[PDB]
Write a protein that binds this ligand. Structure first.
Ligand SMILES: O=C(O)CC[C@@H](CC(=O)O)C(=O)O
Length: 499
């Protein structure tokens, strides 16, 4: 069966609720639901569901001209009314979509013609279109699929206008998608796709080796990085390491002891040996990260000073900061307390645990005792809102979120970044400039803003950049080159031309 292919994923696709996050896997959501406008690599956008559009001279009111020849998955019709209903459906939950400034920007939406769609915003929002193209929450599910007239409280059956229809899902085993025969665009060469739920990376590797897996698409965690290196040397397989897409780092808690002290945060930076960590835990397959964003990220090439591995400098800062060594002890104490710091991570994540132990051992050489708290992913995401952490693995989102959406998110008190930045005297001002960066049409004002924000976050040592990671692919040679989607979180299955 060429028309058909099997792949893998650590967890099920989820309910495929277009307007909800966890556990709805993004790539999947992007398979079923579509946007009015679609994101391009050049950073621009092309018309999609919205055939073309028009805007008020004052740029606050927008009117899109939808496609008529577009039928929802279940034969139903896609029109301005369903659209308005989705937006409305989404906005009824605006509070949680607070991270995406477009959310708290939509004044209201209403249906003009059967195909005319009018959107008015509080302001002439320049990130309007690029933010509609996102995988969520402004995608569309048939109105005839709510739990009342609400999607925030669940949906009926995941039906959209995508080219892929979730034909079947079975907890802990697989998720099946079939080609949507009544799609409005080009016909996807693959007719069926099957995702095998396989948590372990080593298992995913063997799974591929049996011949039962056509492809493996994911990030640094896909399969063990050394096996991937053996795999790329194998004539019968095919592998690919994309260039960096986002950065992984630790987030230090400024609003909590002892990470409430700039000295301790700076010292934590000079104590970790990135390379040794990278070469040893990531198998030299990814690259070292000095700043929150790589210099190749628009607006981020700021010449920020990299903190180099320097145990020497490390313990010197720490002591001047009042954390001295007591007779007969390896760990530093201040006014009675030891320099203990807890590091939370997904206990069942082989990668996090490794960098964890390395970091732990690195810190111990400067008199700091870090405790590893490997926990359920649910408790981890919990401590991120709660702010119950000392240090915490965290990562950016790749294009097109980085850097504007990811910054926007820092303002919302419902996330790790906000939480970690809390105890910063700069915070109020930083959030002020993020809203301003999202608000100015002047490129030079924008350049300066990103500079001020990113320089503060950097100088105040909020994070401990570790590495810029890549997307990897392992596939059967018959599938040819596996393309990358402009949106970092999507998998371009429709482009895969088998044999
Ligand atoms: O799914 C998205 O579009 C953004 C979700 C984001 C976390 C959040 O803001 O709740 C993330 O973890 O990437």
């Amino acid at each position: 069966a060429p028309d058909e292919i099997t792949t893998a994923w650590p967890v099920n696709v989820g309910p495929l609720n277009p307007h909800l996050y966890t556990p709805n896997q993004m790539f999947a959501q992007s398979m079923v639901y579509e946007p009015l406008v679609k994101y391009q690599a050049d950073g621009s956008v092309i018309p999609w569901l919205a055939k073309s559009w028009t805007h008020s001279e004052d740029g606050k009111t927008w009117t899109f001209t939808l496609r008529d020849d577009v039928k929802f998955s279940n034969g139903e019709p896609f029109d301005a009314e369903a659209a308005a209903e989705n937006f409305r459906a989404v906005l009824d939950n605006r509070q949680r979509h607070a991270w995406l400034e477009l959310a708290n920007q939509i004044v209201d939406v209403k249906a003009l013609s059967k195909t005319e769609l009018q959107i008015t915003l509080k302001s002439a929002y320049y990130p309007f279109l690029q933010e509609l193209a996102l995988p969520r929450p402004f995608r569309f599910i048939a109105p005839s699929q709510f739990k009342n007239h609400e999607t925030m409280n669940g949906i009926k059956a995941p039906i959209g206008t995508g080219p892929w229809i979730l034909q079947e899902s079975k907890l802990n085993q697989y998720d099946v998608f079939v080609r949507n025969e009544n799609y409005w665009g080009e016909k996807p060469a693959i007719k069926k796709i099957t995702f095998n739920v396989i948590p372990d990376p080593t298992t995913r590797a063997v799974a591929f080796e049996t011949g039962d897996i056509d492809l493996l698409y994911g990030n640094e965690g896909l399969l063990p990085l050394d096996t991937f290196a053996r795999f790329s040397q194998n004539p019968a397989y095919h592998t690919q390491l994309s260039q960096p897409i986002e950065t992984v780092m630790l987030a230090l808690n400024t609003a909590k002891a002892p990470t409430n002290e700039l000295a301790v945060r700076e010292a934590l930076n000079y104590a970790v040996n990135k390379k040794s960590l990278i070469d040893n835990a990531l198998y030299g397959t990814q690259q070292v990260a000095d700043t929150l964003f790589a210099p190749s990220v628009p607006y981020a090439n700021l010449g920020l000073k990299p903190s180099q591995y320097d145990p020497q400098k490390a313990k010197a800062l720490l002591e001047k900061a009042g954390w001295t060594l007591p007779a007969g002890k390896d760990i530093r104490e201040k006014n009675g307390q030891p320099l203990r710091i807890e590091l939370s991570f997904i206990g069942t994540d082989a990668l996090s645990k490794s960098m964890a132990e390395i970091i732990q051992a690195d810190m111990r050489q400067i008199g700091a005792d870090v405790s590893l708290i490997g926990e359920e992913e649910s408790s981890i995401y919990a401590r991120q809102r709660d702010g119950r952490f000392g240090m915490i693995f965290h990562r950016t989102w790749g294009a097109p979120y980085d850097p504007h959406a990811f910054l926007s998110s820092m303002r919302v008190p419902s996330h790790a970044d906000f939480q970690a930045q809390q105890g910063l005297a700069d915070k109020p001002l930083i959030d002020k400039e993020i809203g301003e960066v999202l608000a100015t049409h002047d490129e030079t004002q924008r350049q300066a803003l990103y500079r001020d924000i990113l320089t503060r976050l950097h100088d105040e040592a909020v994070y401990l950049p570790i590495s810029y990671i890549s997307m990897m692919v392992v596939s059967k040679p018959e599938l040819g080159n596996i393309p990358y989607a402009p949106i970092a979180t999507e998998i371009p299955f429709e482009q895969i031309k088998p044999v």
